[PDB]
Design a protein around this ligand. Sequence first.
Ligand SMILES: Cc1cc(Cl)ccc1[C@H]1c2c(C(C)C)n[nH]c2C(=O)N1c1cccc(Cl)c1F
Length: 92
Amino acid sequence: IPASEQETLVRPKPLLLKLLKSVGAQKDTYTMKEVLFYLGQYIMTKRLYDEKQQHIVYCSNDLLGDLFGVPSFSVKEHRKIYTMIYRNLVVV
Ligand SMILES: Cc1cc(Cl)ccc1[C@H]1c2c(C(C)C)n[nH]c2C(=O)N1c1cccc(Cl)c1F
């Protein structure tokens, strides 16, 4: 992943906007740096991820699972994560 990806400007679709508003101030347009931070905070605050979970995020009974279309995923597959995120936003 190039560092430049973090500067991408994005407009979240409603379901992503719903999640983002649960952990941070509502903007219409974000950087990817912002979207990633807020998703990370959503995950951690809801303890969907911990050390000794084998790098797995568990999100089956959750808004995140709806967004991502998976019951769980590895925090190690960065490319796959970006893909799951982009299906819920529009680039600016
Ligand atoms: C920010 C974030 C968001 C989401 Cl959805 C998942 C993981 C993270 C985050 C993360 C965590 C906790 C915050 C859940 N633990 N390990 C990692 C990791 O590598 N992360 C990460 C950072 C930059 C780009 C990508 Cl692609 C990442 F997947």
